[PDB]
Design an enzyme around this catalytic site. Structure first.
Site, short mmCIF file in Angstrom:
data_model
loop_
_atom_site.label_atom_id
_atom_site.label_comp_id
_atom_site.label_asym_id
_atom_site.label_seq_id
_atom_site.Cartn_x
_atom_site.Cartn_y
_atom_site.Cartn_z
N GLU A 199 -0.17 -10.01 -1.13
CA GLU A 199 -0.63 -11.42 -1.19
C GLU A 199 -2.11 -11.46 -0.82
O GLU A 199 -2.52 -12.13 0.14
CB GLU A 199 0.27 -12.31 -0.34
CG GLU A 199 1.62 -12.59 -1.01
CD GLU A 199 2.77 -13.04 -0.11
OE1 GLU A 199 2.55 -13.15 1.11
OE2 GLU A 199 3.92 -13.21 -0.64
N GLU A 211 8.30 -9.33 -5.06
CA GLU A 211 8.85 -9.86 -3.80
C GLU A 211 9.30 -11.30 -4.08
O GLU A 211 8.47 -12.10 -4.50
CB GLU A 211 7.83 -9.80 -2.65
CG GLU A 211 8.41 -10.23 -1.33
CD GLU A 211 7.35 -10.66 -0.34
OE1 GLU A 211 6.67 -9.76 0.19
OE2 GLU A 211 7.21 -11.89 -0.11
O1 LIG Z 1 9.35 -15.08 3.98
C1 LIG Z 1 8.15 -15.10 3.65
O2 LIG Z 1 7.40 -16.06 3.84
C2 LIG Z 1 7.52 -13.83 3.06
C3 LIG Z 1 6.30 -14.09 2.18
N1 LIG Z 1 5.73 -12.83 1.64
C4 LIG Z 1 5.32 -11.91 2.70
C5 LIG Z 1 6.52 -11.55 3.56
O3 LIG Z 1 7.46 -10.94 2.71
O4 LIG Z 1 6.26 -10.61 4.57
C6 LIG Z 1 7.12 -12.84 4.16
O5 LIG Z 1 8.28 -12.47 4.91
#
Ligand SMILES: O=C(O)[C@H]1CNCC(O)(O)[C@@H]1O
Ligand SMILES: *[C@@H]1O[C@H](CO)[C@@H](O)[C@H](O)[C@H]1NC(C)=O
Ligand SMILES: [Cl-]
Lengths: 74, 383
Positions: free
Chosen positions: B65, B183
């Site tokens: 990100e 992700e």
């Molecule tokens: O749950 C979330 O907001 C995510 C967003 N992307 C980064 C991360 O995976 O470390 C985070 O846990």
């Protein structure tokens, strides 16, 4: 009426996904858990992970950019 | 805050992936910067050297990100520079025993996080060295998400526009590059308690898989297999949650060749249907067989009619419904009315089909999702 008619397109593959299409992550944050060794050591967790083979396992997350590799550290 | 990890930490992760039959992708720290804000590859060089000594088969990403770097570390890295950084990393991997490994990136947030300019300049700069373009998606904020949000077709449909916006950037810069959700889950901020970890989570997860496959995403990486966030597939007691069982059933039944299904009703968006060739690594089924999967977000049972010439075929139903008393907020799921549980710590249960009487409509209860394998479909695209 609760009956619905389906249309199907079957002439050709529209896309080819990877055999690993459904893949999973482990958050880089888990490597800051004192129990990290115990958890990923779990034969139970390995049985469950094997069920999803073939798959990528992506290790990453916010903590990706706040982790430093120490070849000295135990 | 910065934190270090050991050879032991790498060995544990590698062995977990290796012994589970998974392909490890490791995110490298992209905030290690020179005075000039070039990527400093020296820490990554230590890690690549260690993994080399061990004969570890690993693929790589660089940064997570990057759009958030100003917010999260008061460092702004434009996409052109990050592209330059991927090029240095690629030269490293070529000058290592990881010469044949893969490199993915840049793990940007979804279009709604105003990431288009960063992704476009990144692909212009560094697109030549990445094997797939990775981006992230969440439907909701975990802190504010409601039960109705998880059941809302209008929430599910927003994902379609997110995917079209990502393809618009990629088409303009690296047309034909593979696109990965690197992700993804229901709700950011660690998930929505009693929503992201329940039967209710499966509507968003199965729809995202269906739309991802239909729209040309090659790989979808679920946040997370196991961890602190409520969107985990496996909980803190190592018990599989409903999304784990959904994921296993998807893997067993759904093939790599994506087809299309649609409802003739002109509206709702409440009945959602997807069609692939059946997984042929599955021994009950044969070349030509179809796997339909369907979501019913209506509050009544709906009856699906298969079109000509599939309307007299033998169909195996694989219907998922929650085990009570907590309904859609349950952490336990039944397959055709049998509760899904591990037989023991080494053994997954059989996933038992329910054959339907040939020529029957496909019954899909309210707030349920189901796979249907159309046996002897003899579809030449699936041969
Ligand atoms: O749950 C979330 O907001 C995510 C967003 N992307 C980064 C991360 O995976 O470390 C985070 O846990
Ligand atoms: C379904 O939702 C409607 C709202 O349009 C409601 O009035 C109706 O009672 C619901 N039916 C059932 C079967 O729960
Ligand atoms: Cl975690």
């Amino acid at each position: 009426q609760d009956v619905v008619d389906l249309d199907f397109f079957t002439q050709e593959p529209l896309h080819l996904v990877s055999p690993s299409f459904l893949s999973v992550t482990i958050d880089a944050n888990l490597a800051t858990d004192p129990r990290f060794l115990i958890l990923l050591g779990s034969p139970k967790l390995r049985t469950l992970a094997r069920g999803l083979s073939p798959a990528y396992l992506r290790f990453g997350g916010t903590k990706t950019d706040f982790l430093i590799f120490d070849p000295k550290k135990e | 805050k910065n934190s270090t990890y050991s050879r032991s930490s790498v060995d544990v992760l590698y062995t977990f992936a290796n012994c589970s039959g998974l392909d490890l992708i490791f995110g490298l720290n992209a905030l290690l910067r020179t005075a000039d804000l070039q990527w400093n590859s020296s820490n990554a060089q230590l890690l690549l050297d260690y993994c080399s000594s061990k004969g570890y088969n690993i693929s790589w990403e660089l940064g997570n990100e990057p759009n958030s770097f100003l917010k999260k570390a008061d460092i702004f890295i434009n996409g052109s520079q990050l592209g330059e950084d991927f090029i240095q990393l690629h030269k490293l991997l070529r000058k290592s025993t990881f010469k044949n490994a893969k490199l993915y990136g840049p793990d940007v947030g979804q279009p709604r996080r105003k990431t288009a300019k960063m992704l476009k300049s990144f692909l212009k700069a560094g697109g030549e060295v990445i094997d797939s373009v990775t981006w992230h998606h969440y439907y909701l904020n975990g802190r504010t998400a409601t039960r109705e949000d998880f059941l809302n077709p209008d929430v599910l449909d927003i994902f379609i526009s997110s995917v079209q916006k990502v393809f618009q950037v990629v088409e303009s810069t690296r047309p034909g590059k593979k696109v990965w959700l690197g992700e993804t889950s229901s709700a950011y901020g660690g998930g929505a308690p009693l929503l992201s970890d329940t039967f209710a989570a499966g509507f968003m997860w199965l729809d995202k898989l269906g739309l991802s496959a239909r729209m040309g995403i090659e790989v979808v990486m679920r946040q997370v297999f196991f961890g602190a966030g409520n969107y985990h597939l496996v909980d803190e007691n190592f018990d599989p949650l409903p999304d784990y069982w959904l994921s296993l059933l998807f893997k067993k039944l759904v093939g790599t060749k994506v087809l299309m299904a649609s409802v003739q009703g002109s509206k709702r968006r409440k009945l959602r249907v997807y069609l692939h060739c059946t997984n042929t690594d599955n021994p009950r089924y044969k070349e030509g067989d179809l796997t339909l999967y369907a979501i019913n977000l209506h509050n009544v049972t709906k009856y699906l009619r298969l079109p000509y010439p599939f309307s007299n075929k033998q169909v195996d139903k694989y219907l998922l419904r929650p085990l009570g008393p907590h309904g859609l907020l349950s952490k336990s799921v039944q397959l055709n009315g049998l509760t899904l549980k591990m037989v023991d710590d080494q053994t997954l249960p059989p996933l038992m089909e329910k054959p339907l009487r040939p020529g029957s409509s496909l019954g899909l209860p309210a707030f349920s999702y189901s796979f249907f394998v159309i046996r002897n479909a003899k579809v030449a695209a699936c041969i």
